Amino acid sequence: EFGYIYRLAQDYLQCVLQIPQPGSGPSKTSRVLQNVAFSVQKEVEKNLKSCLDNVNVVSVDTARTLFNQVMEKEFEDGIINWGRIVTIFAFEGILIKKLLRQQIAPDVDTYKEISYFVAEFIMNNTGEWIRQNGGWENGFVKKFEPK
């Protein structure tokens, strides 16, 4: 459901911004996702560096416009795989760091608005593929957990 993906998206932004995580901590799926996405983001940032330097992410609306443009090119051939889904999280980690430097508004809670539209994109555009490929715990985790 939506609430599950919204939680993964918020946890990943929390990981990128190094904001503390209390108690129970992230679920095993969240921890596997954070480890994989952190490594993809390192590659993505280097490859998209010129694009990132060209843009002014002054607000959540600007971040959404840029996210929409990047998703349209990322999925141009129509194919979905776990690598491309991890790339969606890597891109939200990149947008939140741009917002941290360039956002005009003094609003720290903008990451929850970012997590929200990213999760609605993952659900609306890739939700049927995720359900066909085993879901998060029985598909994503099984593929990316250490053996």
Ligand X SMILES: */C(=C(/C#N)C(=O)NCC1(c2ccc(C(F)(F)F)cc2)CC1)c1ccccc1P(C)(C)=O
Which residues of the shown chain bind ligand X in the complex (CB under 6 A)?
48, 50-52, 54-55, 66, 69-70, 73
Query: Closer to ligand X at the Cβ: 8 or 95?
Result: 95
CB of 90 to ligand X, least distance (A): 11
Say how far apart CA 83 and CA 114 lie, in whole Å.
20
Query: Closer to ligand X at the Cβ: 24 or 50?
Result: 50
Say how far apart CA 66 and CA 95 lie, in whole Å.
8
CB atoms within 10 A of CB 108: 11
CB of 67 to ligand X, least distance (A): 8
CB of 94 to ligand X, least distance (A): 6
Query: Closer to ligand X at the Cβ: 31 or 98?
Result: 98
Is residue 128 exposed (0-12), middle (13-18) or buried (19+ Cβ within 10 Å)? exposed
Query: Closer to ligand X at the Cβ: 18 or 54?
Result: 54
Query: Closer to ligand X at the Cβ: 52 or 80?
Result: 52
| Position closest to ligand X via CB | 51
**Cβ neighbours for 129, distance < 8 A, ≥ 6 positions apart:** 80
CB of 54 to ligand X, least distance (A): 4
CB of 140 to ligand X, least distance (A): 24
